[PDB]
């Protein structure tokens, strides 16, 4: 389920075709507002523990916006996930 959620959020890179239309809200907002140069979600697993989150690369004046959006998406999924996005994930 964590990976399914992570797929929904996706990843992004400034060489992706089509940005504004991307499914992931993080991805599309990042592409339209140039908040990012890249970002990716991840689920590192180790025995009985692991790292679950995201890493991103950006300009000095966009870290605050990138975090706001990244965090809005986790929250949104926690409390508000819809059905078709889960299917896509």
């Amino acid at each position: 389920a964590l990976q399914v959620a992570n797929a929904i959020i996706g990843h992004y890179d400034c060489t992706y075709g089509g940005g504004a239309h991307l499914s992931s809200p993080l991805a599309s907002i990042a592409a339209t507002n140039k908040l990012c140069q890249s970002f990716q979600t991840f689920n590192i697993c180790y025995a009985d523990t692991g790292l679950l989150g995201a890493h991103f690369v950006c300009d000095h004046m966009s870290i605050d916006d990138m975090m706001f959006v990244l965090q809005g998406q986790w929250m949104r999924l926690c409390t508000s996930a819809t059905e078709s996005e889960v299917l896509r994930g």
């Binding site: 000095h60 870290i63 605050d64």
Partner: protein
């Protein structure tokens, strides 16, 4: 105003930090705090305290003279 991201240039400093939910809010409140206040007290008494005892001394004297001079007084008028 000024915004984070445009303040100034800093190179080479690492800051390590903990989550509040991971640490104590009062660790050695007394063990380390008391000593600390004693130390800040020592560091400043010589500059803060003296002018005030100077006022204190003038405060007690000044009122003392006032009472003895006027009221208490009527000293000698002897005939």
């Amino acid at each position: 105003g000024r915004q984070f991201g445009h303040l100034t240039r800093v190179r080479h400093v690492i800051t390590y930090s903990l989550s509040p939910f991971e640490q104590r809010a009062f660790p050695h409140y007394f063990s380390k705090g008391i000593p600390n206040v004693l130390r800040r007290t020592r560091a400043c008494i010589l500059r803060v305290a003296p002018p005030f005892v100077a006022f204190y001394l003038v405060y007690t004297w000044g009122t003392q003279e006032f009472e003895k001079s006027k009221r208490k007084n009527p000293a000698a008028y002897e005939n």
